[PDB]
């Protein structure tokens, strides 16, 4: 009286229109998303994972999708959107399979097999290349990949230089590793986004205000002041009473010469070592506050003054510039002072930046990105990120892969052929193989419609190329050119990915795609 | 004002097509399913002929009327396959829908189709086997009549049927050049008898026999004789009688109506002293399509002549064929040549009604099928699987190529045609994009066998690869096809499954151009009200 619930048609129909909505924004041609809350909050972003942080999902499905990135963004850092389309295109191939009668074990099976069948080929496919420091003018071409997808490619540019020179500053020659934790990302508004520069050392949030601070000091001193210019009392609990005005300053200048008295200290430093000498300078940290008559002091010897620095960016200041931090002004010693070169501030009524930059082993980087709206702010700094990560596996490791659709085209070849020639599997086998063959066209695919050229041209001239290359006995790597429409060179083009980052791609997409064929119902309970 | 377009048509034609298709797909093959179709006559009939259930459903969508059409080309020509065509043209639209969302132009699927049809025709040359015209393969026609019985019935009439189809074009048709006439062999219906006792009758029957107690029940030898003259009492225009009030007057008034009837009777009675007087086993029989009156009824009986009356004119004209006596319009001009031959003579006894066999004849050229059946549907299902078994028997005396059925001929040409493109490269990268959704729904034929007998349509596709992989190593010739009662694989040519060349060689140009012309309509045009 009962006959099972054939299942399904629910899972798939809903990972479906999930892709439909990532399908658009996939590669250098794809589209700039933008959420709202409702709160006020507008954030436009090209990322898959940053933007699914932002949607609740009811249906079960995307839930796990959004959860296999969470590996991704720790691990590869770049293709979570890839990774996507990888998952939605593999069940509408095998919802043909399916309606045929088709048990999803082979066709979960089928895809396990093909998996382990494309790491033997993933490893004849890549071209392991040098540590040497040299290929920095190969990295260039390289760190484009990740930049020219989430911007318009007209700050790519400008971000080239930047992004290239902010890991190979900090990293020595070595296998060693590097870390991204030491680049510090800071934001300004009310100026173009064209403007972005490079930074060196550090950037300081407050600055000194005054007329006659000088602008530009050339090869100066840092100095760690951890004691507090500020306002003192005496130490001991007391009063101030005066009949008239004029003995309260007497009193209140009693509390004062304590500052005076250091005060007097920290310039005779300045003028025992190359007091007079020319291309000095003496700059004063100070990361307490400062009293507004310290402020006339320091001007007429052209000191820098600067007060309410962050704790977290005072101990980069310890390694960049060398100094280390003075508790005490008796025990002040010529030694503590450090070295920098040339410091100049930027005046601006808003905020004043103090740059730390030009020194010996400065061992830190700033990326400064600032643009006028909201969302120049963001988009920019999804792109920083995901450039500096996707090059982070580059310089760890050795071998690269090139991308524009290079790899997906080539294992869905040579899949399709070794499959006829092994049958070492069984015969049920082929619908798995030929659904996961399929499933890996969808990226070329996918790049190419966001273009407007017909995705149809573009399969057959690739193909037709790669049977041609055989015969010549000759190896030659053919890629999805966007612009002009027809195949391209991937080596010339300069089109690079990682190849830790499609390892677990292709690994990470088919192990959850096929856990969603696996479902039989969809069970509702706890409520 | 803007270019935007739409489908509209092409998804909603599909899903029709789709489900006009599973309706034939479980129709399909010898273990199909049988299907009742009454609308409006309250005549229960169970067919699996495509052609026929698409005439007794009346159809709004406007899908299914171009796929009628189909069916009544391939009746007219070729007399077979209409539920395969069906089959072909809703599954082919199945593959070519997915390709639409591609962006894949609906014209070069239909060119794609026209270079794959013609690429076809040359495997189709050397895939068909010539069969010759002698008189020997009446053991082949075996094979191949069963093919065809195999697919209407419950294969238990299959055997009854067997001798009774090969048997009926055999002797009908003489060997020769000549050509063949369907329409010459006979068809009687009844509905008393099972129709697991069903014969076959090589001469004619006919309806109204004479009724006599004393007729004989066989007559061996017996001579026809065609007798145009009544027998029986006539009156004027006018309604009028002879009423006689004395013995004297009895005999005056009833002359003038046998004045006719005696004139005739006693010239007939001489003709059996003169001939068939003395030569025993043998018989003498009038036709006399008019009718008989009660007075000779008595004269037939004391010579036992067989008395007929109420006789089909159309039936008399096959008589001259059959015996080869001419019809006599006088017997005063009676020759002893107008008497024909006949063999054993012998009447049935039933209440209701009664049978005359002219069987056994030297030179009949002309057959009988007599189909019996306990019900009403049991005799449409019979007759439409007589007529079904003709039509394929008509094509293989006139054609002498033969093709193997049960998936070999599709199973072979939709893996020829894959990897044919592949390696000579000479139509079009972006062509052959399409030609792959044609030879992907020529193999919907041998999964459809297998689905309706609940076996995995994937597991009998792999083991057919498996076969044809180790025939391509080997340069001889062997042919595989699917055996649905074993599962496994089987070759054709041991199990006798043959189907005719003229009908599939239009299967696939026929399903060719009423499959195109579905997928070029982009917009339905509804106008005229």
């Known amino acids: 009286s009962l006959r099972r619930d054939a299942a399904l048609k629910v899972n798939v129909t809903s990972a479906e229109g999930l892709q439909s909505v990532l399908e658009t924004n996939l590669g250098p041609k794809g589209t700039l998303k933008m959420l ?24 079960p499905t995307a839930v796990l999708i959004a959860r296999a990135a969470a590996a991704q963004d720790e691990i590869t850092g770049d293709g979570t959107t890839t990774v996507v389309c990888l998952v939605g295109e593999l069940l509408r191939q095998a919802h043909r399979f399916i309606q045929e009668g088709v048990h999803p074990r082979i066709i979960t099976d089928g895809f396990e097999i093909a998996r382990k ?29 990740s930049l020219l997808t989430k911007v318009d490619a ?17 990293y020595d020659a070595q296998a060693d590793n590097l870390d991204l934790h030491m680049v510090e990302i800071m934001q300004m508004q009310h100026l173009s986004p064209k403007d972005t520069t490079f930074i060196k050392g550090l950037v300081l949030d407050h600055g000194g205000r005054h007329p006659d601070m000088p602008t530009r000091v050339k090869n100066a001193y840092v100095l760690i002041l951890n004691v507090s210019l500020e306002y003192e009392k005496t130490e001991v609990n007391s009063g101030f009473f005066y009949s008239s005005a004029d003995q309260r300053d007497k009193l209140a200048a009693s509390e004062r010469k304590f500052v005076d008295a250091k005060l007097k200290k920290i310039i005779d430093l300045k003028n025992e070592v190359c007091g007079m000498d020319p291309d000095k300078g003496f700059v004063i940290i100070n990361q307490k506050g400062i009293d507004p008559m310290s402020l006339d002091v320091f001007a007429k010897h052209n000191i820098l003054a600067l007060r309410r620095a962050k704790r977290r960016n005072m101990e980069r200041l310890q390694l960049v510039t060398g100094g280390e931090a003075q508790n005490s002004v008796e025990d002040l010693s010529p030694q503590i002072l450090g070295f920098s070169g040339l410091v100049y501030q930027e005046t601006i009524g808003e905020e004043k930046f103090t740059y730390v930059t030009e020194n010996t082993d400065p061992k830190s980087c700033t990326i400064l990105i600032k643009g006028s709206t909201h969302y120049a702010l963001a988009q920019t700094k999804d792109a920083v990120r995901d450039g500096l990560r996707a090059v982070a596996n580059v310089l760890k490791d050795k071998n690269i892969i090139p991308g524009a659709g290079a790899f997906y085209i080539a294992l869905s070849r040579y899949l399709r052929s070794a499959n006829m020639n092994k049958l070492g599997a069984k015969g049920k086998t082929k619908t798995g193989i030929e659904a996961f063959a399929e499933a890996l066209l969808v990226i070329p695919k996918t790049l190419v419609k966001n273009s407007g050229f017909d995705p149809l041209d573009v399969l057959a001239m690739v193909e037709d190329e790669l049977d041609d290359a055989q015969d010549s006995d000759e190896t030659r790597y053919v890629g999805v050119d966007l612009n002009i429409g027809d195949s391209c060179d991937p080596t010339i083009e300069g089109i690079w990915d990682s190849y830790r980052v499609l390892r677990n791609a292709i690994t990470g997409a ?8 696996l479902c039989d119902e969809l069970l509702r309970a706890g409520r």
């Open 117 to 145: 069948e494309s790491m033997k080929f993933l490893d004849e496919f890549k071209i392991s290349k040098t540590n040497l420091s040299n290929d920095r003018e190969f990295l260039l071409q390289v760190a484009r990949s």
């Open 36 to 59: 709202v809350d409702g709160a006020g909050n507008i954030k436009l972003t090209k990322d898959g994972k940053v933007l699914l942080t932002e949607m609740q999902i009811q249906s």
């Open 154 to 170: 007209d700050l790519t540019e400008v971000l080239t230089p930047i992004v290239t020179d902010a890991v190979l500053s900090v």
């Open 510 to 517: 088919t192990g959850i795609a096929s856990n969603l064929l």
